[PDB]
Design a protein around this nucleic acid. Structure first.
Ligand SMILES: [Mg+2]
Ligand SMILES: [Mg+2]
Ligand SMILES: [Mg+2]
Length: 254
DNA sequence: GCGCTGAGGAGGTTTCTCTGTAAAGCGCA
DNA sequence: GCGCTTTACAGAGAAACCTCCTCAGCGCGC
């Protein structure tokens, strides 16, 4: 779909993918990969359908089932992948990976010896304002949600029937990123920093739940895979929790 | 024959997802 | 000292992420 479905794909690749250059005996593998749960096989084929390229693979890691999409053909990466990531840049320090990948690829580095040593900085490239004000952000955000968002419902206490209903999203070395999301979506809950510099944003209130629901109705593109399914079953649950349904215009198709 | 390729395959570590627990603010009594 | 509702904090492990190898086969020219 859309031109901004490509922006959605960069968000999804930012959340769940990886750029990598790996030794291959005497030479190199340049790759862009995403490996998802088998719950997401249909989305893997929607991604290949959008890009027109990429090898699909299955893995059983002995009881967890996994699907990958991997682009390794260097002419295809130069032609089709870099431009997407030029036109719609990643917002986080995963941009450092695209920049080293792009520089290596375009310089024609083919041996480990000529490959510059890479350590990905923890320091952000953008500000809140710079993230929030770019034209493609909301479309990026649907894919980043596709990758990293969580919609859940849970009992507040074992003994009662009081249900919570939360949306939560996290990123390591992601103060700015996550705060930008908080800002844009008018969330006011405190971002939590854990032992491993992973910033975590979680919301529960009626108004915040009303805010993400409204953002995803009005966003340029929609959720496509298993998060889309998680989104609909959450909504299902939401229609039967009084505080939410008697204050939110919930449903739709999608 | 030779330099180099990527599909197909797989070993290794950890960031997110998902679901809370404990504590409390609001308002009413 | 109680319904209802929200939030600061955080743990487990599945779902992400990161890394390397073999071997047909290609596109040249000795
Ligand atoms: Mg991620
Ligand atoms: Mg992730
Ligand atoms: Mg994910």
């Amino acid at each position: 779909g859309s031109d901004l479905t490509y922006a959605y794909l960069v968000g999804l690749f930012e959340g769940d993918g990886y750029f990598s250059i790996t030794k291959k005996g005497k030479y190199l593998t340049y790759e862009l990969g995403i490996e998802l749960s088998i719950k997401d096989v249909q989305l893997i084929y929607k991604i290949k359908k959008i890009l027109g390229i990429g090898i699909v693979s299955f893995r059983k890691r002995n009881e967890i089932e996994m699907v990958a999409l991997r682009i390794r053909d260097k002419n295809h990466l130069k032609s089709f992948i870099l431009p997407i990531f030029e036109k719609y840049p990643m917002f986080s320090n995963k941009q450092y990976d695209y920049l080293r990948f792009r520089n290596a690829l375009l310089s024609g580095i083919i041996s480990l010896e000529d490959l510059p040593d890479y350590t990905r900085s923890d320091e952000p490239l953008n500000s809140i304002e710079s993230i929030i004000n770019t034209s493609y952000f909301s479309a990026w955000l649907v894919g980043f949600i596709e990758a990293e968002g969580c919609f859940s419902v849970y009992k507040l206490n074992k003994d009662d029937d009081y249900l919570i209903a939360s949306f939560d999203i996290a990123q390591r070395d992601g103060d700015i990123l996550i705060s930008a999301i908080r800002k844009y979506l008018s969330f006011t809950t405190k971002v939590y920093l854990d032992k491993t510099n992973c910033s975590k944003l979680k919301v529960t209130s009626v108004r915040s739940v009303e805010n993400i629901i409204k953002f995803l109705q009005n966003a340029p593109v929609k959720l496509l895979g298993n998060k889309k399914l998680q989104y609909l079953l959450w909504l299902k649950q939401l229609r039967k929790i009084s505080r939410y349904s008697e204050k939110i215009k919930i449903p739709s198709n999608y």
